Symmetry: C10
Subunit: 75 residues, 10 copies
């Protein structure tokens, strides 16, 4: 009981480390969005859906970390 619960909680905190990837990744995408629109304003409608897609896929990796975090805390 003690040792198992404690491990679940240490694990849950550790599980949030991977989120740093999405934090950096989402930003890399929006940076490219911003620089690409600055260089070529007319391409805006083409690249904005590309940035939304990029962000969502990168964010999905953080979600998977958070899922493990929640499984440990609750499941």
């Amino acid at each position: 009981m003690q040792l198992v619960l404690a491990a679940k909680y240490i694990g849950a905190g550790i599980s949030t480390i991977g989120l740093l990837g999405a934090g950096i990744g989402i930003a890399i995408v929006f940076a490219a969005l911003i620089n690409g629109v600055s260089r070529n304003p007319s391409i805006k409608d083409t690249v904005f859906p590309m940035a939304i897609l990029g962000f969502a896929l990168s964010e999905a990796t953080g979600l998977f970390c958070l899922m493990v975090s929640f499984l440990l805390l609750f499941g």
Copy 2:
């Protein structure tokens, strides 16, 4: 219940590591906003809302980290 409490506190500490991602990310987004507007002043009103969106989505990964940290501390 000593070992479990101890684990909650170490876990809360560990849970904040992931915030370094939003720290760097938010900065990356604003860096691009600054560089983009330097190269092309007239694009400001178009890219500023993109930088705000980018900020918010990168920040969210930090929010999740802190949420787990506070669930371990208090929840």
Copy 3:
């Protein structure tokens, strides 16, 4: 049995660290896609499938992490 179960749950958490690589990586690919299309719009149809391939291969590395995490969890 407690100690082993404890080790399984610690390990499962540690197994997610590697996902930061796919997070950053997937983004590096889409960043290139966006910059490449901004500089040269006519190249879009050629590079978009290259970005899909690149994203998928990068993500897979993180899915192998998740796989190990689930093996330990369950």
Copy 4:
């Protein structure tokens, strides 16, 4: 009592690691300000408030880490 107290101190230390993001991120913002102003001095008044907003938001992530640190310490 003593094991819990020990954990608080270890946790307080671990809690400062994330401050490295703010340290790097603040620098990233000022780097762009400097490079932006060098390439186009006349844009200074426009980008300075952007740089202020940027580093303030980046620094805040570090203060959140420090918030947990001081919660664990006191």
Copy 5:
């Protein structure tokens, strides 16, 4: 032998960490492929096999991590 099995599981979790390098690496390669084809479309057939090669070699390093991870798990 609770201690030994425990060590195998934690060690299996740790072994996946190195996969992040493959995640970032693979992305670095496809990013360059995309940027290179954008700047010079006619170079596509020459650089695409180079990109496959770079992906494979970078991926190999992920394979070795997963290999040690599976050896500890089974």
Copy 6:
């Protein structure tokens, strides 16, 4: 209380890790200062105070780490 004092010392060691962000950040700022003055010498008096400011803010994050580190040591 061997356990508690132990925790203070390990925790003091961990608290210095975040200093690496200040180490890299400060460098990022001076790098940009140097690159900016190289490209545009006449901008020196305008960007130099910006660089001092960026250094100070990035350094502050290191200060907070050392602060938690000293609080645990004493």
Copy 7:
């Protein structure tokens, strides 16, 4: 006996972390090859052997990590 055996398995896992350098480094080399060949296709024959030398030396660092890993395992 069992504590030492446990340590070997944990150590074997930790030992694969450094493979992330080779994973990223191999990619860095191929990225430069691709970008170099895109900007100047006629330099291909000159830079390819350089890229081979570069990634071989970078990959070797990862094999040294793996050498320790397998020493600890067997």
Copy 8:
């Protein structure tokens, strides 16, 4: 006393991790110096003292790590 002494020696080792920041940082500064002088030789006397200032401030962050390491060691 053993446990505390053990914690001092573990902590001292951990206290050196932060030095990686000054290692990378000092290099970032000199890289800028070299690139700035290559692009604009006549700027050398102006930027060289800026590089000295930047290197010294970056290094100091790593010396504060070493300071903590020595406090724990002795």
Copy 9:
């Protein structure tokens, strides 16, 4: 003498982490050699020895790591 042996083995593992530095570093040096020669073919004979020197000095940091690893394993 179980705890000490155990510590030698974990320490040896930890000692290899630092090799990721030479891995990335060596690559950085060769990347620059490749990009430099692409931009200016005629500089090859001048920069190749610089790349070799650069390789050797970055590699040395890995050598020291592995040296400590082997001292813990065997010495």
Copy 10:
């Protein structure tokens, strides 16, 4: 005795982690050396002493890590 020796050896392995900084740093310097000479071959004699200095200072940080490593192992 046991616990102290074991800690010294775990510490020594941990002490080599910072070396990754010099591994990457030395390389960053030689990269700039190579790209700067490629762009402007005539500046070679001015920047090469700058790269030697940069390398030595960056390498000094790795030395400090290795010093701690050796103090733990032997001192």
